[PDB]
Amino acid sequence: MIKQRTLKNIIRATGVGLHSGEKVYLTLKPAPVDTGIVFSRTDLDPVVEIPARAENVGETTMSTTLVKGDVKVDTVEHLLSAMAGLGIDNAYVELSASEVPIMDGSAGPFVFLIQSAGLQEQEAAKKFIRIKREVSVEEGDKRAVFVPFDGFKVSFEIDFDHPVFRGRTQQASVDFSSTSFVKEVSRARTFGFMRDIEYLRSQNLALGGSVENAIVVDENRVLNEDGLRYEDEFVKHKILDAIGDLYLLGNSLIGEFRGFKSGHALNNQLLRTLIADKDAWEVVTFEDARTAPISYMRP
Numbered sequence: 001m002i003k004q005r006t007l008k009n010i011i012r013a014t015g016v017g018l019h020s021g022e023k024v025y026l027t028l029k030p031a032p033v034d035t036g037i038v039f040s041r042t043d044l045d046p047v048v049e050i051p052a053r054a055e056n057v058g059e060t061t062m063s064t065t066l067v068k069g070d071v072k073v074d075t076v077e078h079l080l081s082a083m084a085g086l087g088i089d090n091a092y093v094e095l096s097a098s099e100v101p102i103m104d105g106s107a108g109p110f111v112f113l114i115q116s117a118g119l120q121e122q123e124a125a126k127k128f129i130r131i132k133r134e135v136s137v138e139e140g141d142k143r144a145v146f147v148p149f150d151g152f153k154v155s156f157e158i159d160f161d162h163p164v165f166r167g168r169t170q171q172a173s174v175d176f177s178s179t180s181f182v183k184e185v186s187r188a189r190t191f192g193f194m195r196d197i198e199y200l201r202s203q204n205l206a207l208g209g210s211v212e213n214a215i216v217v218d219e220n221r222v223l224n225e226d227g228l229r230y231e232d233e234f235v236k237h238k239i240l241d242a243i244g245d246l247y248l249l250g251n252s253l254i255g256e257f258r259g260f261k262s263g264h265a266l267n268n269q270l271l272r273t274l275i276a277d278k279d280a281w282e283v284v285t286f287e288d289a290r291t292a293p294i295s296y297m298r299p
């Protein structure tokens with residue numbers, strides 16, 4: 001059967017919250033079968049735990065925030081993208097503060113730390129959500145869609161209206177059967193356009209933001225002296241964001257996501273609409289990994 005996965009060993013990391021600018025200590029711990037991904041604020045007494053599920057999303061402004069009463073875990077999307085790309089079902093994510101550390105702005109450091117610790121298969125069938133019907137949400141010129149597909153693929157189209165894109169929309173499609181999340185998506189960084197800076201300022205956001213954790217773009221060019229990691233790094237990062245948000249479903253997807261100028265807000269509306277429409281999805285397991293429409297790396 002395709003089995004559930006956890007971490008083989010504990011992972012420790014330190015860094016800064018993109019939004020908060022706070023120093024944060026992160027611990028990823030193995031978790032039992034059917035735990036899912038659970039964030040824990042260990043700075044609070046008692047400890048406050050928030051399952052990484054669509055129902056716990058409280059804010060979708062420039063990040064995905066989990067909320068339980070007055071308690072937040074901000075910017076979950078890049079870490080959750082890492083745990084989706086590595087097929088992790090069960091893990092405790094402990095944080096000493098309100099935000100996941102930004103690291104280099106990408107999922108790269110997370111996939112490296114996790115794959116350094118290793119994964120552990122568990123004696124329970126991995127549960128998948130299979131898309132059975134098309135599910136579409138729009139608002140204005142933004143759209144986000146689930147389409148039936150015997151695999152997992154993400155398509156994204158952005159029109160950022162900026163010289164750096166040379167009058168073209170940026171588009172990419174990745175099928176994770178045939179294409180490496182690790183090599184082709186995980187290294188795509190957070191980006192900040194200087195034209196958004198008075199907005200971020202106005203909102204007291206991106207307090208931890210610098211060239212160390214984001215592609216910084218002025219009116220014309222990437223200012224990062226070492227340039228881009230991918231020719232299309234902006235749209236590859238949008239794909240990374242969407243994989244992170246999609247993992248709030250609580251199970252790996254069998255289907256296709258299409259985004260059209262979509263972001264955290266519309267991604268989370270799509271999830272809510274999918275969950276609500278039980279005609280459009282079912283939970284499936286695979287007794288034979290050889291005949292399933294997806295596969296995983298050795299643990």
Ligand SMILES: C[C@H](O)c1nccn1Cc1cc(C#Cc2ccc(OCC(N)(CO)CO)cc2)on1
Nearest residue numbers: 062063075077190191192206209210211214216241
């Ligand atoms: C998190 C979400 O999933 C996400 N992923 C991709 C983009 N975003 C949204 C976002 C982007 C920023 C930023 C930023 C930022 C980066 C650098 C920066 O530095 C500007 C400067 N002061 C250098 O320190 C001048 O160069 C300022 C803001 O904050 N939220």
Ligand SMILES: [Zn+2]
Nearest residue numbers: 077190237241
């Ligand atoms: Zn992001």
